[PDB]
Design a protein around this ligand. Structure first.
Ligand SMILES: *[B]([O])([O])[C]([C][C]([C])[C])[N]C(=O)[C]([C]C1=[C][C]=[C][C]=[C]1)[N]C(=O)C1=[C]N=[C][C]=N1
Ligand SMILES: *[B]([O])([O])[C]([C][C]([C])[C])[N]C(=O)[C]([C]C1=[C][C]=[C][C]=[C]1)[N]C(=O)C1=[C]N=[C][C]=N1
Ligand SMILES: *[B]([O])([O])[C]([C][C]([C])[C])[N]C(=O)[C]([C]C1=[C][C]=[C][C]=[C]1)[N]C(=O)C1=[C]N=[C][C]=N1
Ligand SMILES: *[B]([O])([O])[C]([C][C]([C])[C])[N]C(=O)[C]([C]C1=[C][C]=[C][C]=[C]1)[N]C(=O)C1=[C]N=[C][C]=N1
Ligand SMILES: *[B]([O])([O])[C]([C][C]([C])[C])[N]C(=O)[C]([C]C1=[C][C]=[C][C]=[C]1)[N]C(=O)C1=[C]N=[C][C]=N1
Ligand SMILES: *[B]([O])([O])[C]([C][C]([C])[C])[N]C(=O)[C]([C]C1=[C][C]=[C][C]=[C]1)[N]C(=O)C1=[C]N=[C][C]=N1
Ligand SMILES: *[B]([O])([O])[C]([C][C]([C])[C])[N]C(=O)[C]([C]C1=[C][C]=[C][C]=[C]1)[N]C(=O)C1=[C]N=[C][C]=N1
Ligand SMILES: *[B]([O])([O])[C]([C][C]([C])[C])[N]C(=O)[C]([C]C1=[C][C]=[C][C]=[C]1)[N]C(=O)C1=[C]N=[C][C]=N1
Ligand SMILES: *[B]([O])([O])[C]([C][C]([C])[C])[N]C(=O)[C]([C]C1=[C][C]=[C][C]=[C]1)[N]C(=O)C1=[C]N=[C][C]=N1
Lengths: 178, 182, 179, 180, 179, 180, 182, 181, 179
């Protein structure tokens, strides 16, 4: 905001700041930043700070798949709160390089959505959101080491975790101490 | 709206065992129709009742309050479609006493599958989808019994809005006769 | 609005029905109930249906139309002011020889209007339905006026305003009621 | 709103109809029904139509106009307050010799108003219709006032306010009713 | 709202009319109908018109004004609360000698208000009409109060509030009604 | 709306029939409670028939009805038509034992209470404790009325749970499916 | 949108012949994408262009502005689905250079039939219905050519919303490869 | 929105004599397109101009500001339909230099009669009706000149919305060539 | 909007001013500022004012009109699209011999529009003002076209649409610019 703006100045040092809800506009910007940083240097780590209430699942997967596709390691650092698709992206950082600050919060839960129309249309929408949850649970299981059954049970309702609990859960690797 | 020497016009027709269904079907309408049906049975459990239907449809459970009351009471309930019987309106038309389901010649009948909505967590959406799918299975089973068509044919024919003339509704089994002028 | 009965209830006692609004399911339900009541009171005496209406729902209009044709009494139709769209269709539906308009009353005919929203498949279903509805209206209007279906189709493509004398020449009414 | 009957129903018992609002289909249907009822009660006795109206729908006004001319009784018209637009047309439609205005009542005449939207072909249809409607109104008003159609056309091009005395000079009424 | 008849209908039985609202065409239609009804019942007995009104439409007020002057009975006018604008004009229109205000009633006089929109020619027509309406009001108020038209014009250029005693001095009423 | 002078519902009340056919709020409960009290005063022994087609509503309003049913001397039969959901299914289960019915295609739905809380953490805690105690109260009564364990009721009301009339009988929410 | 040593991030990617289509498709978006394609061809008529697609779809005519420009220009336009390619977005994904249409492993693809509206006289509704049906036939024919699926199968599979994984989109022929991590 | 170095993408294309119409046509759009056409004639009075058209149409008088400017200036203005050219958009497509009017293969063209509104006194509605009818006659006369169809055929073919494929638009005379790859 | 100058800034370098909107105070102050700037750059060279405008505020238009007459350079006016109301007034205000319209440009002339609300005295003031404003516009338009004031008054009573050829015949422009 102070004028580079401050975010452009941090991007020069390979730091991307996610500090909002995740929608297609945010995801397209984050993806473009990741591809640019890879083009600048395919070896150096990238740092993705996350303070986000979540957002669109498909927008989040644009970021997730780009993180996994590019050559650089992407460190993830939770400040404030990583909720919903934000906590999914926090867990998507390079293994060994996923962090939270000591008073940061992590929240996990199941996807939300809506369906309107004919019974046949509602069935299609329900099957899609159920398949999307299975996809999220399968990946979270791979990234945390927890069973798919445990992820399913633990996301049935809003589940708030301290930074220490998120490390225990396998969502992060370390609580970043001063 | 007008008054007869004092009854409003619908109260006057109710004295002759005629019930007019001429609106969307919601709980308020169903409560009134059920009450009229129970009242008419208490007055005379043998005489026929006449239910005129001009309705775009409405709530499935409100329609089933009327449907079940029709089947519970002793009097035959004749159904007469004027104008249009759509959605739950055509379901109630088909629910009239066998042999006593009618449509006037230019009345229209429309059948289709139920509509609804669901919002919230994936598990809540799944519960709502399962509920509306089961409701459709229930409606199709009854319509099959009342029309003679197979459940599979009902399912195919209600996937989208399906408009029938009075003559087509008779051929389908939704009514027994097209009422020709007296 | 005034009391004597309200004024419309007082006229109903003399077998007069006033259709003086847009035609919707509520209006059709009331008119059909009045027609059925009058037939039950006396199945031989004429009924008088005054029409001042901009039109309205086609299915609501057909509830009235089919009830007129079903009951035993002749239903005279009398246009005052304007009978447009489904209003002019009901005007033409009165007992043959007993369809009237006052000298400065206006009659308007046109094709049905509607809407469709959604998938291409759903728009196609809605279009086929409104087109079949137009064919149904045109066939009946042809029968009631003596005009060919082809002429009715041409003459309803756009709004077509008729004077009372032109409505008689067209076959929508039988007589212009003079003082 | 007072009860005696409400006050209007009580006056209707004495063959008086009160027009005190804009003229739309609901008002016209009521007035036509009152006129038909009064003729059925007695086809010989006069009816009195009081008019305080800003005007309204032309077709609704013609429902009233044609019913006045159709029925057997003379319909006296009495302007109180203001008879504007379709209201002044109905004032002039009273039985000749029995059209009145009170001394400070106002009369306004002007041409019809309307709207049109859509394709050029549709706008043309709507324009032709309102122009034919104006010709019809002007022709009848010429017959009822004795003024030429050309003068009626000129005098209604814009809002034209008349005193009661001016309305009598114009032929819209027959007499200014002075205090009894 | 209470019932005895509702309270106002009960007062009308004793020839009392209550004007307690803004004056519009609906109110004038009711007041005029009550005046005609009372004259038809008895053309000699006085009528009592209570006035608590902020004013309203000039033509609606003149419907009432001309009916008061037309009918045979004397119409006493009694201001309670406030008689403003067309309300004070109607107060002054009561039978001479029978116009009253209660001691703390307020009277306000001012010039007409209106609006005009459109072409210059239309604005000119509207301005001429409201100016001619103001001249008519001033001429009648001059006759009713005994004040010159020139004085009425000056005293109504802006809102002019009067006590009951001042209204009597002005000629708008004849007496302040004491207990 | 029709008249028999009685409206149709007043006419049914003469035969000890009460129709609950809307959402349950304080106004509806006030009306139902008053009808129950009136019927007891007319005849303290004869059965009352309460038809239920309701999506539910306020818990405290529902308990005004519930406690009145249990307080009065007459048995209250409950008859579900259409749908008895949420507090509606609670009241259906509250009818006199042996006299709780559903029509064959009527639906029953049970779930836990819903609410909201806003303000300071202390205020949110008070509101949360209140809705949890309210849920425990509902579940304890439903367990007594159905014969199901409290643990099963809690399990079966965690989310919306739709039951057919035959399933509602098997569950213990009603005693019989009313056949034609 | 951050700035780079001065470019905004998207202008910086355009320097390397990368176009980001990351919103609903309307005339404004199509004007921008078409102008970028024309500019890139003018810079170099031989080098590939990369079109990233994360779009819920949008206007069919706006999508065809982009589609026809992709086919008209000389460079191959690679298409890469990230996140979701739905409706006209999945149609443009399938429009990339054959062999150079990609989706990331967790990207979603959705296909369905066109949506629209019609209001007015019966003859106007008929004109609008005929137009949207002809538009659907055009989309299906091109999608058949681009995927290898029959027109009949496309019609069947787009009757309702049809969600596909990246792997299923490859089997369907909408893309050529699922891009696995580098 | 993207920048080329500094030009926005549309300014960079204008440097190569390309004008992009990609919106409804209102006075603001017409002011901009007229200004670009004047500027390009000032930069070079001989070289062709390329006007891409993807437009639902819009104001007739705004469209005529563009139309008259195309005919007035010395350079040939090529018109290229991408997406859709409807209503005044198809009128402008047909207004390009003869032999240099193009549509891409899946571009749509739609022709129809003008739309408008009128409110007020009968005399004002008559003035408004006469104006829109004269405007329709003007549009039909010019479209006849530019397509080679008779005025009577243009009138009949524009009574309702009339959608054409690119190939149908060429046969009609609205364009000269379907641009193939 | 096209930018490196925007396109309008580039045309201003060549002494071209583009009027392409309604005329309000913001537009007038921009146009006046451009005219004054151009005069300061070169007081001898012509200025070109393109006009496509539905009109607007009379006083804003007179800010432009008086500036055109005040500065030394000839201001050519060129109508493209439509010059209506104050737009056609400004079109007629260009240097004599240098007022143009393109062949399919339209010109519309009519009387001023406005509004007035409040006391009768206030409506009278507003009516007198718009009437004097119309007299001022007609007198200037008479001078710039050669038509009598009486003819201008008659021809602007309602909306009067003119082709470019008719506007030349009327005297609002000097030439229809052919290709
Ligand atoms: B969360 O709350 O951020 C969650 C992500 C996940 C890891 C549990 N996101 C969602 O549940 C979103 C909510 C949303 C709906 C609509 C617009 C934007 C965001 N859901 C989806 O993206 C969704 C919904 N239905 C089907 C598929 N995806
Ligand atoms: B119809 O359109 O009348 C139809 C009845 C038919 C298929 C026999 N009714 C419905 O589909 C209604 C629509 C509706 C929704 C919400 C409020 C009122 C009406 N559906 C339901 O009643 C419904 C929806 N979801 C689940 C169960 N029931
Ligand atoms: B008219 O204008 O009254 C006309 C009747 C005439 C052609 C004999 N009615 C309609 O066109 C109505 C308009 C309408 C739309 C929506 C609500 C109410 C009225 N159309 C229909 O009733 C209709 C019927 N079937 C299909 C589509 N529209
Ligand atoms: B007046 O102002 O009441 C006037 C009557 C006068 C000329 C004898 N009436 C109208 O101009 C009405 C206005 C109106 C429009 C819409 C709803 C209600 C009233 N005009 C018409 O009735 C009309 C308009 N266009 C065509 C035909 N009739
Ligand atoms: B007053 O404020 O009541 C006043 C009356 C008079 C005795 C000075 N009335 C008006 O000025 C009204 C205001 C108004 C009320 C309701 C509708 C419209 C206007 N003015 C008019 O009645 C009127 C009369 N002729 C022209 C314009 N306005
Ligand atoms: B149900 O949905 O009818 C249910 C009743 C129960 C037996 C499962 N009712 C509620 O959950 C209501 C919802 C409501 C909220 C606000 C106003 C009206 C109704 N809840 C309560 O009444 C409630 C909520 N919080 C605390 C106490 N009571
Ligand atoms: B999709 O949902 O994006 C779809 C494209 C197709 C490949 C399945 N687009 C549409 O269905 C659009 C929806 C829309 C409507 C209105 C404005 C913008 C977008 N339809 C159309 O573009 C359309 C509608 N009717 C006729 C022709 N084209
Ligand atoms: B079209 O749909 O773009 C069409 C152009 C023509 C070639 C058939 N445009 C119009 O019909 C416009 C529509 C419009 C109305 C109002 C504001 C903006 C656009 N009509 C006019 O420009 C018009 C309307 N009435 C009179 C004169 N011109
Ligand atoms: B026209 O429509 O541009 C016209 C000018 C013509 C007669 C040469 N202008 C006006 O009539 C404007 C309309 C307007 C009203 C309100 C805001 C903006 C524009 N009228 C006036 O500027 C005006 C001037 N004096 C008094 C009242 N109105």
């Amino acid at each position: 905001i102070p004028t580079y703006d401050i975010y452009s100045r941090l991007l020069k040092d390979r730091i991307i700041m996610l500090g909002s809800q995740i929608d297609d506009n945010v995801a397209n910007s984050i993806v473009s930043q990741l591809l640019f940083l890879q083009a600048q240097d395919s070896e150096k780590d990238i740092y993705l700070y996350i303070n986000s209430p979540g957002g669109s699942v498909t927008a989040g997967f644009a970021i997730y798949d780009t993180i996994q596709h590019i050559k650089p390691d992407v460190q993830t650092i939770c400040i404030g709160m990583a909720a919903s698709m934000g906590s999914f992206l926090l867990a998507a950082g390079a293994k060994g390089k996923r962090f939270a600050l000591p008073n940061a919060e992590v929240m996990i839960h199941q996807p939300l959505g809506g369906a309107q129309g004919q019974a046949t249309e509602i069935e299609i929408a329900a099957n899609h959101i159920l398949k999307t949850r299975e996809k999220l649970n399968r990946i979270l299981s791979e990234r945390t080491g927890q069973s798919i059954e445990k992820i399913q049970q633990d996301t049935d309702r809003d589940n708030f975790l301290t930074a220490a609990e998120a490390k225990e859960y396998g969502l992060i690797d370390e609580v970043m101490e001063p």
